[PDB]
Give the backbone structure.
Amino acid sequence: XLXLXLXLXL
Amino acid sequence: XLXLXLXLXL
């Protein structure tokens, strides 16, 4: 679902 | 890097 991965940072 | 994806438990 969420936590680490994609969405913020990049 | 973060936000959506994996890390919330799964």
Observations:
- Chain B touches chain A at residues 1-8, 10 (CB under 8 Å).
- The radius of gyration of chain B is 6 Å.
- Chain B is about 0% helix and 60% strand.
